[PDB]
N, CA, C and O atoms as a GROMACS GRO file, in nm:
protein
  572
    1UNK      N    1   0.351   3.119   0.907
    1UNK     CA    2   0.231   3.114   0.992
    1UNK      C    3   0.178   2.972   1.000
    1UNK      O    4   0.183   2.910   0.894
    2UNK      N    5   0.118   2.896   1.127
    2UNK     CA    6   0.043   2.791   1.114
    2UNK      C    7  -0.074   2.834   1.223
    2UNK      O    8  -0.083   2.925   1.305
    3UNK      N    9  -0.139   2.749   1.193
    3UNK     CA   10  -0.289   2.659   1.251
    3UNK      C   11  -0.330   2.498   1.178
    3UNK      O   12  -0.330   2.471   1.058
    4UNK      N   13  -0.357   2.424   1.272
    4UNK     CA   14  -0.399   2.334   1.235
    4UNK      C   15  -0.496   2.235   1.328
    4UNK      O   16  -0.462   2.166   1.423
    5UNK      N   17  -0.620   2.251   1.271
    5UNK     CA   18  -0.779   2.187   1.336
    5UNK      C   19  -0.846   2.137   1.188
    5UNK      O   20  -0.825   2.173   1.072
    6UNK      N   21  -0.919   2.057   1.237
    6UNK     CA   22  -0.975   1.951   1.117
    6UNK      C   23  -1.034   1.895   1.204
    6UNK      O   24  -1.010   1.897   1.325
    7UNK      N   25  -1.161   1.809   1.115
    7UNK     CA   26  -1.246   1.712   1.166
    7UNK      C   27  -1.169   1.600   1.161
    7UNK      O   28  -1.190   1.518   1.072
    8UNK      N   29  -1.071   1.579   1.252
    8UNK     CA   30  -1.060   1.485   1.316
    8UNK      C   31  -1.169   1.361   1.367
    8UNK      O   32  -1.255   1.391   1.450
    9UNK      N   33  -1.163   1.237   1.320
    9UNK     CA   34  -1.281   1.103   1.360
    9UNK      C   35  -1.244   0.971   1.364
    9UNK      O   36  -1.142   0.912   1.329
   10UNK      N   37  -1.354   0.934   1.417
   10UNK     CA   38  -1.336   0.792   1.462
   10UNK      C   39  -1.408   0.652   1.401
   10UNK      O   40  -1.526   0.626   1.424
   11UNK      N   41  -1.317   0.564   1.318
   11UNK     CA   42  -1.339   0.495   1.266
   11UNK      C   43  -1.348   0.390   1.328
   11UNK      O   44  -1.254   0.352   1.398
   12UNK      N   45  -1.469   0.314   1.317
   12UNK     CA   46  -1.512   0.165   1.445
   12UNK      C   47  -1.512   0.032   1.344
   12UNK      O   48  -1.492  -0.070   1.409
   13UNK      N   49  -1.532   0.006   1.188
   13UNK     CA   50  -1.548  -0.058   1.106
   13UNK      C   51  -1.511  -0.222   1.160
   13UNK      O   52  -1.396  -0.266   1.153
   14UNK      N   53  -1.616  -0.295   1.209
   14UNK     CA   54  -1.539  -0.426   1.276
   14UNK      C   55  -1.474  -0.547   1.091
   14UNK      O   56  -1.394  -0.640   1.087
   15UNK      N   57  -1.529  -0.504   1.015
   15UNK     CA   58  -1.503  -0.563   0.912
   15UNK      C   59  -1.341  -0.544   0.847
   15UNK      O   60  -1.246  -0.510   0.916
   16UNK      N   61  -1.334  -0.572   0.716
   16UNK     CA   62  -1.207  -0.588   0.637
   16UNK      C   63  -1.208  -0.676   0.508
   16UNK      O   64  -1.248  -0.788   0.476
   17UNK      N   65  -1.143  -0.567   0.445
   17UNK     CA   66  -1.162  -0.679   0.269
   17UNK      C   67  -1.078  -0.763   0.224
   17UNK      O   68  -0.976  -0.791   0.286
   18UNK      N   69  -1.101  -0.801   0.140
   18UNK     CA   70  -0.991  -0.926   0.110
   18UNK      C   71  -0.994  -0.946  -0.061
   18UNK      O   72  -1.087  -0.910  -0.132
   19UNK      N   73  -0.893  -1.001  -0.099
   19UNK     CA   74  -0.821  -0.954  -0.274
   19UNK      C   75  -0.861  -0.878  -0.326
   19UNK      O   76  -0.940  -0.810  -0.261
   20UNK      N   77  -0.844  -0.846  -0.439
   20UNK     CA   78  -0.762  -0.726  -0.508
   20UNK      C   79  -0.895  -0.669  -0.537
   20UNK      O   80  -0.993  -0.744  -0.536
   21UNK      N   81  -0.908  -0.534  -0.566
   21UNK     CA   82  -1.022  -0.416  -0.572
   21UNK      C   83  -0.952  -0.296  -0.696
   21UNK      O   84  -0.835  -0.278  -0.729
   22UNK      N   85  -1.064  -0.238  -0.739
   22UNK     CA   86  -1.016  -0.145  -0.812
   22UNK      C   87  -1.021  -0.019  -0.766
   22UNK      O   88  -1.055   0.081  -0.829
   23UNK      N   89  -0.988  -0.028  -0.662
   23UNK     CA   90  -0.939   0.152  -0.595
   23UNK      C   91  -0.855   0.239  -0.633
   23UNK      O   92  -0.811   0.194  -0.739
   24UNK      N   93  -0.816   0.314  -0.616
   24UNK     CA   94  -0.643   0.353  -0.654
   24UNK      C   95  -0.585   0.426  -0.519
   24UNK      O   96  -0.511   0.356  -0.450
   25UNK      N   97  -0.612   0.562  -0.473
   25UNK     CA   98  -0.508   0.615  -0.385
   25UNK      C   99  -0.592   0.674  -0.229
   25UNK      O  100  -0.563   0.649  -0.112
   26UNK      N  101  -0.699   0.759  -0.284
   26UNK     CA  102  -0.759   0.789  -0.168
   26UNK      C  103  -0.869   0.690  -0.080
   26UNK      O  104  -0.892   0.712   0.038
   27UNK      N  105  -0.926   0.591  -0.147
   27UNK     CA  106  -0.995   0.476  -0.097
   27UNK      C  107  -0.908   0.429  -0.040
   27UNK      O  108  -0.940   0.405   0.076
   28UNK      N  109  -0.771   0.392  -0.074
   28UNK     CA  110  -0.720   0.295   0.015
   28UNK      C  111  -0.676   0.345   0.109
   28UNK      O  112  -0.657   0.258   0.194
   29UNK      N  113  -0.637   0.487   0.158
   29UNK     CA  114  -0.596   0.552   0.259
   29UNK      C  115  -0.685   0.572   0.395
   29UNK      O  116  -0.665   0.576   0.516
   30UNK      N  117  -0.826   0.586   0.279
   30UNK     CA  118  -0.956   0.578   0.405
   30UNK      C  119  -0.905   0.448   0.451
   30UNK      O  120  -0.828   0.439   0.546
   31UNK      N  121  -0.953   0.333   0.374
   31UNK     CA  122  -0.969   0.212   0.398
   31UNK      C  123  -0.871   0.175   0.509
   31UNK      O  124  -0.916   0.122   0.610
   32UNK      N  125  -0.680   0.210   0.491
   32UNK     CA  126  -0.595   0.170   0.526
   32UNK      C  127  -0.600   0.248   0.709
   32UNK      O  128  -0.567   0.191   0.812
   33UNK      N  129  -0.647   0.377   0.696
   33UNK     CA  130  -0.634   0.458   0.827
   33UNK      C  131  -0.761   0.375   0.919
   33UNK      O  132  -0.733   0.316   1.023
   34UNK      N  133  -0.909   0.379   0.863
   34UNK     CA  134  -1.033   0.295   0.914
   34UNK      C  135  -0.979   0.207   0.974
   34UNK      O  136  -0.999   0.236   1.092
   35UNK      N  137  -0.896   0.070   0.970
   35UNK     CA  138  -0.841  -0.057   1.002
   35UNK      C  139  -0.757  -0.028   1.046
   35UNK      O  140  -0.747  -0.105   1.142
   36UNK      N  141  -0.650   0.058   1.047
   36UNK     CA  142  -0.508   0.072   1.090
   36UNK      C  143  -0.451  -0.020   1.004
   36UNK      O  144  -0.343  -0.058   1.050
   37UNK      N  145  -0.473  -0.060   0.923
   37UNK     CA  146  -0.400  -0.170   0.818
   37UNK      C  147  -0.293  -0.119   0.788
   37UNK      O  148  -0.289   0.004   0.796
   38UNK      N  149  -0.168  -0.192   0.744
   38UNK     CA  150  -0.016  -0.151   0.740
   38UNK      C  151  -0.034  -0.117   0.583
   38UNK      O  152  -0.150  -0.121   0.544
   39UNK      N  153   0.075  -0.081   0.474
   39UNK     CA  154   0.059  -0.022   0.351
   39UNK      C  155   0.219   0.036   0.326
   39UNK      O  156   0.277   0.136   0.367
   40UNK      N  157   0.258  -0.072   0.242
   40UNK     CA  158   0.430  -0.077   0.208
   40UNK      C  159   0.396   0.042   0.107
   40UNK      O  160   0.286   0.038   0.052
   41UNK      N  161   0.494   0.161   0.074
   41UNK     CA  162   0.505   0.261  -0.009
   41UNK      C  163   0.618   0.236  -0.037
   41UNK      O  164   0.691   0.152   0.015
   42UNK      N  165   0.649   0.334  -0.150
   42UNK     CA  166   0.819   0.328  -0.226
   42UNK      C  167   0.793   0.514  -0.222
   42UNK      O  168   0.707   0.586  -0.273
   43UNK      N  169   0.905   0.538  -0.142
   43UNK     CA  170   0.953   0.702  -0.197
   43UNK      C  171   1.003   0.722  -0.317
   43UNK      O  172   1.042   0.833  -0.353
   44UNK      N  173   1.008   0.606  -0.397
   44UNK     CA  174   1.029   0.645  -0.563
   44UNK      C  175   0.938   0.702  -0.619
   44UNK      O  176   0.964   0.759  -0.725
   45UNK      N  177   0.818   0.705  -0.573
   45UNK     CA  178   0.664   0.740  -0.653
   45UNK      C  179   0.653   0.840  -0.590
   45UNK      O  180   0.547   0.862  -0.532
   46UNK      N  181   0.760   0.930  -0.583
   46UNK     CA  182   0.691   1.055  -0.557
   46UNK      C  183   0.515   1.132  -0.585
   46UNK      O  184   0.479   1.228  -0.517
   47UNK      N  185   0.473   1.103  -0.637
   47UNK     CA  186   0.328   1.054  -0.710
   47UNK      C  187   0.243   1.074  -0.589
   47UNK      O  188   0.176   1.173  -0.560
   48UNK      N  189   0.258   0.978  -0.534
   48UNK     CA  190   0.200   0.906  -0.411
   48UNK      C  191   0.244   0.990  -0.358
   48UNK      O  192   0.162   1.079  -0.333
   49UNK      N  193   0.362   1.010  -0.318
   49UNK     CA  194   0.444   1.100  -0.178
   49UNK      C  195   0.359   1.268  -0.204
   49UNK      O  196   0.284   1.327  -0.127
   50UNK      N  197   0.383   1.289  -0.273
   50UNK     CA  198   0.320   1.442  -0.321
   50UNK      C  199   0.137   1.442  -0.250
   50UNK      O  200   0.086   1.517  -0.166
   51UNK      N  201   0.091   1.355  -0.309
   51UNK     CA  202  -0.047   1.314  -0.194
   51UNK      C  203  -0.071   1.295  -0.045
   51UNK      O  204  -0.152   1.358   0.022
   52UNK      N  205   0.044   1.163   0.014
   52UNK     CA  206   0.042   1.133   0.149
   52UNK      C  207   0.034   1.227   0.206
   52UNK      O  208  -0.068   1.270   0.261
   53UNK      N  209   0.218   1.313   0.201
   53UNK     CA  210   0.310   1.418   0.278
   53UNK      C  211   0.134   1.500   0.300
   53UNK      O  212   0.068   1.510   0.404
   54UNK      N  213   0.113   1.528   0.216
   54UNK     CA  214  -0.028   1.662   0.251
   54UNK      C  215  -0.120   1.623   0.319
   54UNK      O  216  -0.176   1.687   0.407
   55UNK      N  217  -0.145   1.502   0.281
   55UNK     CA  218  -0.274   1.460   0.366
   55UNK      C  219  -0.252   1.451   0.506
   55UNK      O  220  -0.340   1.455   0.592
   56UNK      N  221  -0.097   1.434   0.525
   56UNK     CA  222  -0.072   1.392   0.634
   56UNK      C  223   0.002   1.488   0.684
   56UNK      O  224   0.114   1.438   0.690
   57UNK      N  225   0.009   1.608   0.728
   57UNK     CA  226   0.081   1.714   0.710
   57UNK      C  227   0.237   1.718   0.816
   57UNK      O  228   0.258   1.656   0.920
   58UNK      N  229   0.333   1.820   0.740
   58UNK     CA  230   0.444   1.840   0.856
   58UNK      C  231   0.547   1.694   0.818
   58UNK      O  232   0.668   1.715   0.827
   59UNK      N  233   0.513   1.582   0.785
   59UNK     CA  234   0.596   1.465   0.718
   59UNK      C  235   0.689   1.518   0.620
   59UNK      O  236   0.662   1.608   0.540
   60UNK      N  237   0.819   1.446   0.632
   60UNK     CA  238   0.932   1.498   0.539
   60UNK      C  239   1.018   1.428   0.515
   60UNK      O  240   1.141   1.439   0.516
   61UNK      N  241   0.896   1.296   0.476
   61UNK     CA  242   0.996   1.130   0.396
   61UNK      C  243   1.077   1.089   0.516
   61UNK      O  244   1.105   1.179   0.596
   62UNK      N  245   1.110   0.994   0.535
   62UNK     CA  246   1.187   0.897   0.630
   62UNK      C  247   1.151   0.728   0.572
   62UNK      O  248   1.053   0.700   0.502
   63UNK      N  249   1.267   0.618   0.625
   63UNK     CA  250   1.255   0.510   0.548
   63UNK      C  251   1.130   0.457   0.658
   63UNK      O  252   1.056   0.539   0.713
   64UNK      N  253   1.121   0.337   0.677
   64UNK     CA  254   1.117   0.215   0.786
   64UNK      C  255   0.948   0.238   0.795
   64UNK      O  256   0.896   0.318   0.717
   65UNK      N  257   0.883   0.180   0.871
   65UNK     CA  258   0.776   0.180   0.962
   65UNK      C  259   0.746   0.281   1.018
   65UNK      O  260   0.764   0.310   1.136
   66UNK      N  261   0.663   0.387   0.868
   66UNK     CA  262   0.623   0.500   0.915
   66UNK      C  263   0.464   0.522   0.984
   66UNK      O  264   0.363   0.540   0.916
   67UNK      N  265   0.468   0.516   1.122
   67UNK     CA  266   0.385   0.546   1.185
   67UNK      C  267   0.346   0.711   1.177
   67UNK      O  268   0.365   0.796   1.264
   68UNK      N  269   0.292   0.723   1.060
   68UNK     CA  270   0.236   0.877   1.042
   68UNK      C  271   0.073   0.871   0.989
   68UNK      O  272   0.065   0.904   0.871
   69UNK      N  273  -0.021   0.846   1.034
   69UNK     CA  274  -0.154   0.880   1.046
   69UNK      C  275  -0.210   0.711   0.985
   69UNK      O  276  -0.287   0.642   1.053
   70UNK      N  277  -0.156   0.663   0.846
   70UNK     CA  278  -0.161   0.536   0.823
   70UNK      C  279  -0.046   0.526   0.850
   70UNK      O  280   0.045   0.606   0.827
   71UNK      N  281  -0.042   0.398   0.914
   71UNK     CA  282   0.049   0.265   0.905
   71UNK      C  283   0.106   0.222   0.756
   71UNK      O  284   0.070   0.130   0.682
   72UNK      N  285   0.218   0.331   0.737
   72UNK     CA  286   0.313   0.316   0.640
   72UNK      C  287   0.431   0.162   0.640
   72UNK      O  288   0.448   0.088   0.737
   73UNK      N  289   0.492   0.149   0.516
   73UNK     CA  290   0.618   0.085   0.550
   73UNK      C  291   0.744   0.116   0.412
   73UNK      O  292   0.762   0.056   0.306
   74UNK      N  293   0.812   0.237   0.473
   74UNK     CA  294   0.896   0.312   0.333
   74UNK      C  295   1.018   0.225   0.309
   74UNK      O  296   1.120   0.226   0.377
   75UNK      N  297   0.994   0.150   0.205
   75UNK     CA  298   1.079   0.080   0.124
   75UNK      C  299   1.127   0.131  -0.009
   75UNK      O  300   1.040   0.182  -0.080
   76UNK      N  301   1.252   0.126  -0.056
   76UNK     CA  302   1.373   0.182  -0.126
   76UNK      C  303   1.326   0.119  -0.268
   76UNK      O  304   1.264   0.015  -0.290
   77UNK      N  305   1.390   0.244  -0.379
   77UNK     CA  306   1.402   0.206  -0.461
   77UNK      C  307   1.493   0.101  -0.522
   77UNK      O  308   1.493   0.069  -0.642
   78UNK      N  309   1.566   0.052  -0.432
   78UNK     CA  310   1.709  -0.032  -0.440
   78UNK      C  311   1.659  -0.155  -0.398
   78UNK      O  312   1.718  -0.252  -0.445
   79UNK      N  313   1.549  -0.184  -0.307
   79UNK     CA  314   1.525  -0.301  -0.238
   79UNK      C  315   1.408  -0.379  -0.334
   79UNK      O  316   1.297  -0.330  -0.351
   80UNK      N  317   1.462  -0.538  -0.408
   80UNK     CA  318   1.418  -0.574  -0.459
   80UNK      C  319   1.275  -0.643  -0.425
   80UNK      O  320   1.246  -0.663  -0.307
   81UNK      N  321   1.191  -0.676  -0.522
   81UNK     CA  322   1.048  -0.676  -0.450
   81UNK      C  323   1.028  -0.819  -0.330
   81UNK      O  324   0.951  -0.827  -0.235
   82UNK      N  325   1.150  -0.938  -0.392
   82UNK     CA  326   1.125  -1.050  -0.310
   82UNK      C  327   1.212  -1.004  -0.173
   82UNK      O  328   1.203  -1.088  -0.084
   83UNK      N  329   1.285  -0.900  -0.141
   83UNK     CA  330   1.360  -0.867  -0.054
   83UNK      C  331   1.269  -0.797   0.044
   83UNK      O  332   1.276  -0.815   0.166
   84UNK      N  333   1.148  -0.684  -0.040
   84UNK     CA  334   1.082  -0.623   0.056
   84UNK      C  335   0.966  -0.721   0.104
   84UNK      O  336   0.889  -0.694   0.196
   85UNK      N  337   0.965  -0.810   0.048
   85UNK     CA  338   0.814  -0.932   0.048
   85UNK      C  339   0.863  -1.020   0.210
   85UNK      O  340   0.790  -1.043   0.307
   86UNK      N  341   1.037  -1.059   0.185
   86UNK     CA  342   1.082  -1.095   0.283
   86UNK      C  343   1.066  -1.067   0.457
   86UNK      O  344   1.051  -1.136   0.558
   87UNK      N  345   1.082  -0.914   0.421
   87UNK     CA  346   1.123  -0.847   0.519
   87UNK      C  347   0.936  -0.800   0.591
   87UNK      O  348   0.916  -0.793   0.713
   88UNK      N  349   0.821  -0.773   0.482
   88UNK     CA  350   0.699  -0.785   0.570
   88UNK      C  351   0.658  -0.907   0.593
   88UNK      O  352   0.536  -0.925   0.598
   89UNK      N  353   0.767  -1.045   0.614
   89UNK     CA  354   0.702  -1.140   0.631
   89UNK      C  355   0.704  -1.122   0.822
   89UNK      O  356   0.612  -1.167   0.891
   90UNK      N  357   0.839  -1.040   0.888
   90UNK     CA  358   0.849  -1.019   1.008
   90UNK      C  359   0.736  -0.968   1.059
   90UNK      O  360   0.704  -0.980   1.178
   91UNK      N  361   0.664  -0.903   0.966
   91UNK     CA  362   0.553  -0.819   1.021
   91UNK      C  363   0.404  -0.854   1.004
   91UNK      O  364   0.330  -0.794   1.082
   92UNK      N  365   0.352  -0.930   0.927
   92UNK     CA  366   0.246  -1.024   0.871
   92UNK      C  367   0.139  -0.941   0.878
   92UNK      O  368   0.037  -1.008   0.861
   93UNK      N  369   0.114  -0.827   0.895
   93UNK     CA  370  -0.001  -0.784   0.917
   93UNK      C  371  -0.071  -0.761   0.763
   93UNK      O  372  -0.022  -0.758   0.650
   94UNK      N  373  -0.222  -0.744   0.823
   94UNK     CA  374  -0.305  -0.735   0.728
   94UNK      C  375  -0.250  -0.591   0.657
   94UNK      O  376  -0.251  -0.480   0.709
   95UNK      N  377  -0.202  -0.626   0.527
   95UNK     CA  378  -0.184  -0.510   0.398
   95UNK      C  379  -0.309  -0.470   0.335
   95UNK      O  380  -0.404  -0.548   0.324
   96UNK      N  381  -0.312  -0.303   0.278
   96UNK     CA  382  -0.390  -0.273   0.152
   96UNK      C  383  -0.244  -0.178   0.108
   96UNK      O  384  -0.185  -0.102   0.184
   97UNK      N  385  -0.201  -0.211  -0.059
   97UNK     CA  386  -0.185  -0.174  -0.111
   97UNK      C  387  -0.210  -0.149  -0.267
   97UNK      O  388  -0.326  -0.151  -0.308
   98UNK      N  389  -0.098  -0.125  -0.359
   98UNK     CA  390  -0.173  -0.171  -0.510
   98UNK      C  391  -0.022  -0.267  -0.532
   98UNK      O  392   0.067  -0.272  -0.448
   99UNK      N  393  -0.019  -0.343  -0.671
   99UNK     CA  394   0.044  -0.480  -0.687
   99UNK      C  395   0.229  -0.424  -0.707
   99UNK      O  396   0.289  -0.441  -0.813
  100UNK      N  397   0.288  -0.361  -0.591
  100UNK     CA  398   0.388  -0.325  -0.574
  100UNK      C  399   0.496  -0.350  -0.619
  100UNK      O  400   0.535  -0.235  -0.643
  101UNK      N  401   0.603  -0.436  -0.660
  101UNK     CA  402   0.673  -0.469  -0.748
  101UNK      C  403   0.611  -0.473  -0.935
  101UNK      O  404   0.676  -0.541  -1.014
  102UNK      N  405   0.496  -0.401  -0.981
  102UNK     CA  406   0.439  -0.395  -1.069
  102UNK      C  407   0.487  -0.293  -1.193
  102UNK      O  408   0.510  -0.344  -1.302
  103UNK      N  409   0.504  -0.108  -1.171
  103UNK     CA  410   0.560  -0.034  -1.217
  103UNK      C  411   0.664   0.029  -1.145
  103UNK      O  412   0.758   0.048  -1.221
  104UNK      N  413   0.693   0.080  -1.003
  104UNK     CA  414   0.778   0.145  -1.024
  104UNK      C  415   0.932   0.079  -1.002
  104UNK      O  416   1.032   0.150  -1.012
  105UNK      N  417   0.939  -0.051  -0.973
  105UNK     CA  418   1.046  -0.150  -0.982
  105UNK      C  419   1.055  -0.169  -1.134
  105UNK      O  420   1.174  -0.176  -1.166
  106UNK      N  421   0.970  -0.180  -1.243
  106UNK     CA  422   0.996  -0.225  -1.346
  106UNK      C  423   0.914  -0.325  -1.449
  106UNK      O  424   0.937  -0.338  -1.569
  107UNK      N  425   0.817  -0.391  -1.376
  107UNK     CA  426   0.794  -0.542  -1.395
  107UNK      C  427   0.657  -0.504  -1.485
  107UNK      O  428   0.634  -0.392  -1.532
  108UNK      N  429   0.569  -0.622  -1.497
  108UNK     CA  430   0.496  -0.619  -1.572
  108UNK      C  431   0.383  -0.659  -1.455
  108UNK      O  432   0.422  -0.686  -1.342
  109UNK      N  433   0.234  -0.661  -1.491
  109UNK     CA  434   0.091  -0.766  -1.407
  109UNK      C  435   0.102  -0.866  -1.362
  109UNK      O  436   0.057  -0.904  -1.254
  110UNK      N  437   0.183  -0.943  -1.460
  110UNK     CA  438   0.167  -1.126  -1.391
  110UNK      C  439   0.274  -1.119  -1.311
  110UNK      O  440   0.253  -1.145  -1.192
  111UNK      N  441   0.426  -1.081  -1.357
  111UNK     CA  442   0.536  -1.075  -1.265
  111UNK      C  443   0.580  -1.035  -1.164
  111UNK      O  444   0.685  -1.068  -1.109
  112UNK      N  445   0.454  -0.912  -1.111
  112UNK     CA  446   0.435  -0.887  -0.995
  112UNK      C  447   0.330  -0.971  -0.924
  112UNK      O  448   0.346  -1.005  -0.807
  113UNK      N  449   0.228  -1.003  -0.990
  113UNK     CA  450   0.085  -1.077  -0.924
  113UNK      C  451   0.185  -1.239  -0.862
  113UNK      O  452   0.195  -1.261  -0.741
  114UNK      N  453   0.238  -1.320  -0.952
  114UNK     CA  454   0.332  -1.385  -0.899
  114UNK      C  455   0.449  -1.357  -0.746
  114UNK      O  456   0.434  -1.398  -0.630
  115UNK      N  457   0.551  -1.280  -0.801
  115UNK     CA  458   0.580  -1.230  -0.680
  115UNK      C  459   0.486  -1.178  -0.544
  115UNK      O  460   0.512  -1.218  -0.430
  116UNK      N  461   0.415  -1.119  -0.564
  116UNK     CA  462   0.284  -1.115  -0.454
  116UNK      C  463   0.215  -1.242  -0.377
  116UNK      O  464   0.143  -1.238  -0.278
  117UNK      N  465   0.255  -1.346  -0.446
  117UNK     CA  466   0.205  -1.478  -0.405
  117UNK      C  467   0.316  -1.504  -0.316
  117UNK      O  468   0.278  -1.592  -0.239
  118UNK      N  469   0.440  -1.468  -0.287
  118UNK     CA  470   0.524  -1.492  -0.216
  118UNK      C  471   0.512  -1.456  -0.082
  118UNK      O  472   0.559  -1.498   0.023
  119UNK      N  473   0.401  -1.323  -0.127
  119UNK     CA  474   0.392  -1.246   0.079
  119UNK      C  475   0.328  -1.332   0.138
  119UNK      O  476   0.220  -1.369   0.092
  120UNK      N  477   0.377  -1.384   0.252
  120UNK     CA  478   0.284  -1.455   0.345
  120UNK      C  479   0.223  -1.374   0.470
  120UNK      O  480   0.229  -1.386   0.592
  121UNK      N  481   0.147  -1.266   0.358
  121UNK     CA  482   0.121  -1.175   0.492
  121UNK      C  483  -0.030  -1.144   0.388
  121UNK      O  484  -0.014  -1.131   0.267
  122UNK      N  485  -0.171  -1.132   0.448
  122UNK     CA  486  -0.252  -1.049   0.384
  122UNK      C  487  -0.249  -0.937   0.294
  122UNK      O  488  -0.148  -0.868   0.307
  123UNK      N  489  -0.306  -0.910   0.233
  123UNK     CA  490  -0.258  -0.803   0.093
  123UNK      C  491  -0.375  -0.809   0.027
  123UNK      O  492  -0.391  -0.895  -0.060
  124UNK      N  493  -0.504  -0.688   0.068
  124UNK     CA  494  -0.555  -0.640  -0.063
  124UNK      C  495  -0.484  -0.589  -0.126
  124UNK      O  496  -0.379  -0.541  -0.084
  125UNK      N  497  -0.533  -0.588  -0.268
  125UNK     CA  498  -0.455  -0.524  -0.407
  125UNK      C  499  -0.539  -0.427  -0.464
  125UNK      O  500  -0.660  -0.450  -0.474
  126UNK      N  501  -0.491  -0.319  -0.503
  126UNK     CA  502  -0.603  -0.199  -0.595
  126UNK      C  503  -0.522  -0.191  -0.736
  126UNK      O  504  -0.402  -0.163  -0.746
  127UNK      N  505  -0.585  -0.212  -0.811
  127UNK     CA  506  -0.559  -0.172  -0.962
  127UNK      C  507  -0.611  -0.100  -1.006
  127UNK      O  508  -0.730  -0.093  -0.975
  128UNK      N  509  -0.555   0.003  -1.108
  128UNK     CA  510  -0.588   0.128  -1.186
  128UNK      C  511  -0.698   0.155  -1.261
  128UNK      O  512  -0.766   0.253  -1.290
  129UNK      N  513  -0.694  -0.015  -1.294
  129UNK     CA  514  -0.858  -0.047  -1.416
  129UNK      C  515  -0.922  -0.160  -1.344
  129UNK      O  516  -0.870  -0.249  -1.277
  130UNK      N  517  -1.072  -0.132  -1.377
  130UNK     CA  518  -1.166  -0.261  -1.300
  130UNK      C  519  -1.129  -0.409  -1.392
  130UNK      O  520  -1.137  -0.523  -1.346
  131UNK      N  521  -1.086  -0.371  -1.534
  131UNK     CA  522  -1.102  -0.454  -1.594
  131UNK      C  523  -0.964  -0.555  -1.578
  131UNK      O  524  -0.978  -0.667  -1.628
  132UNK      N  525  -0.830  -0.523  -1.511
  132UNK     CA  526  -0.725  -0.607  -1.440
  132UNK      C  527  -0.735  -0.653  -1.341
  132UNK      O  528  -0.648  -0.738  -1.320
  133UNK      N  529  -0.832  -0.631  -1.228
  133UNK     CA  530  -0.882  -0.681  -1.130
  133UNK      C  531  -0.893  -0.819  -1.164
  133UNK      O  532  -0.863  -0.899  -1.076
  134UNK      N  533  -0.935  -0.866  -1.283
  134UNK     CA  534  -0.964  -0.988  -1.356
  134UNK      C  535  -0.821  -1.042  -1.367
  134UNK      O  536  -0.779  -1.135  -1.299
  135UNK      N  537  -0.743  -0.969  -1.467
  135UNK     CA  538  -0.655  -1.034  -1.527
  135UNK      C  539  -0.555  -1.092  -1.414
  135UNK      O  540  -0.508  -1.205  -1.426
  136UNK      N  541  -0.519  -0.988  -1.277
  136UNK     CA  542  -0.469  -0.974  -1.174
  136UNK      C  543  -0.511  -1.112  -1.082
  136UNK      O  544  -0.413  -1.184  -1.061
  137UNK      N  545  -0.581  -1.139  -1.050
  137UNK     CA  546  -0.690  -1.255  -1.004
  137UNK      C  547  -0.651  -1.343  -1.100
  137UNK      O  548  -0.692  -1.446  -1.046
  138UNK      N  549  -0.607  -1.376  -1.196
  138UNK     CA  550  -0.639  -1.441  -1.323
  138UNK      C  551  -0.493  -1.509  -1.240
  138UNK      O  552  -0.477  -1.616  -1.183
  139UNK      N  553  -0.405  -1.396  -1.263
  139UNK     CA  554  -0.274  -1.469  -1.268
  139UNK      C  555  -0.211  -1.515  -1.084
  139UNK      O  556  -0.103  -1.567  -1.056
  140UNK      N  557  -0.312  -1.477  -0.997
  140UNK     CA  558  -0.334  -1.572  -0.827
  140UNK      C  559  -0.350  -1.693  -0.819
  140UNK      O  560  -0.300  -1.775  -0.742
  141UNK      N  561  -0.444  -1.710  -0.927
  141UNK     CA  562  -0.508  -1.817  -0.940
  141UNK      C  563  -0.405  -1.929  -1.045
  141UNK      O  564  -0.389  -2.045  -1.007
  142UNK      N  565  -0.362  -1.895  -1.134
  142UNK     CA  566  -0.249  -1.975  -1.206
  142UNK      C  567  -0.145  -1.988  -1.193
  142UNK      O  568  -0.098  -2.078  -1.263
  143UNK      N  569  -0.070  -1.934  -1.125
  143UNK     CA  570   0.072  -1.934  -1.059
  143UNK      C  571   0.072  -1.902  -0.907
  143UNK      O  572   0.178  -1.900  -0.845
   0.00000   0.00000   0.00000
């Protein structure tokens, strides 16, 4: 059986934020859908996917430039982080994500906050704790 109606709305927000915030998943989705802001995902984090897919209903994973309610961009667990950094350089648009090459590639805070310095594309950042927001910033600012 289906139906599907919802308060559907309209977001006018002439503004936009800039470095890293301590959000985690549903702020940034408002945030990311409000702006139409783009937002690189990994289908490794099923995590995440288990959230989107619903929010966003009838979705059933696909790679590339998923135009499904936010402005997705489904990048592989295989594709290394300076490879996917590369490849949104074609696309430059203003990002919100969280510090992506961080856990589910492997890496550690600084070794991603570093690599992140490589995107030459906008990129808020959301971290898990308010209190890395610091450390995260810490390591923008030193490398």
């Amino acid at each position: 059986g289906s139906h599907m109606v919802l308060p559907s709305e309209a977001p006018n927000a002439k503004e936009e934020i800039l470095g890293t915030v301590s959000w985690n998943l549903r702020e940034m989705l408002a945030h990311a859908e409000e702006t139409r802001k783009l937002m690189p995902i990994c289908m490794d984090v099923r995590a995440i996917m288990a959230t989107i897919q619903r929010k966003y209903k009838g979705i059933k994973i696909q790679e590339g430039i998923v135009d499904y309610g936010v402005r997705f961009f489904f990048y592989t667990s295989k594709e290394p982080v300076a490879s996917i950094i590369t490849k949104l350089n074609s696309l430059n648009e203003p990002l919100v994500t969280m510090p992506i090459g961080y856990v589910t590639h492997g890496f550690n805070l600084e070794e991603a906050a570093r690599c992140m310095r490589s995107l030459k594309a906008p990129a808020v950042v959301s971290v898990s704790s308010p209190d890395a927001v610091t450390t995260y910033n810490g390591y923008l600012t030193s490398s």
